[PDB]
Amino acid sequence: GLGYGSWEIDPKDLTFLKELGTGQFGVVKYGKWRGQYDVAIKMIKEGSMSEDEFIEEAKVMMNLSHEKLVQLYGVCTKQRPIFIITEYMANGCLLNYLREMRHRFQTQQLLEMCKDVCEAMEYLESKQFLHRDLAARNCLVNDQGVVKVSDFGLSRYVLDDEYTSSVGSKFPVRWSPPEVLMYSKFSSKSDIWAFGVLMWEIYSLGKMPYERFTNSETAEHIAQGLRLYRPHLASEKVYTIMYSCWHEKADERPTFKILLSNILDVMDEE
């Protein structure tokens, strides 16, 4: 209504129900919009985000609609703090979900999680939109066990330099190809590399990549041409897919369309 653009939600339409924990921009809550519609509400900590830039980008992000992408419903702007309102994912972060041994996952379920992510990424690739921080920590799981990709592109608005400098203590070294670590060359193919690492995280039930190495050691290992190796739960064909994402030459890495085809082949065969 009157004082609101299409990207803007009236915070007075929110009912807060449960705390969901803290992320990098601060508190996240579960609530309802207009009494009925489940939402997640991110309260953006003052000084954590380039807010005017993020708000302009929210206009673009709201047009990205795919069933395996966590939907952005809008932003509560011109208040402190601002809120980001998104599709609620009742089973929480993928990384924590994988680490819960009670689930006793079959490998068919693990491949389905990879396929869910791959479908989201093929869609983003088709829109020339890079995620820029693909990892299990940035995927969520709904009440049906479907995995969706979250927070796509948001790293561009993070003001904490520890996160944004390749040398910063919070940079995602372990999800980065050599050309990112060496010269900050981001591309579709750096998303591809990250996706390979994410498949490794899924098949490793949420182990940290390069778990025995520091970030500095990881960067040296990768830059010298060495890689992660096969998780016990990955078949040879699954391992071949994740490994293909790690070619030293970025142009020899597959596209998300090719990865999706390869994943569906393995689903049929295995």
Ligand X SMILES: O=c1[nH]nc(-c2ccccc2)[nH]1
Residues forming the active site: 133
In the complex, least distance from residue 38 CB atom to ligand X, rounded to whole angstroms: 9
Q: Is 22 annotated as a binding residue?
A: yes
Nearer to ligand X, 73 or 213 (CB): 73
Has 20 been labeled as part of a binding site? yes
State which residue has the least CB distance to ligand X.
40
Nearest to 264 by CA among 139, 128, 118: 118
In whole angstroms, the minimum distance from the beta carbon of 161 to ligand X comes to 25
Full DSSP string of 134-149: -SGGGEEE-TT--EEE
> Closer CB to ligand X, residue 28 or residue 250?
28
Residue 51 or residue 179: which is nearer to ligand X going by CB? 51
* Site residues for ligand X per CB under 6 A: 20-21, 28, 40, 70, 86-89, 92-93, 140, 150
* 27 labelled ligand-binding: yes
Beta-carbon contacts of 18 under 8 Å, excluding residues fewer than 6 positions away, are 29, 30, 31
Which neighbouring-strand residues pair with 22? 27
* Residue 145 labeled ligand binder: no
**CA 227/CA 241 separation, integer angstroms:** 14
CB of 139 to ligand X, least distance (A): 10
Residue numbering of the annotated binding site for dasatinib? 86-89
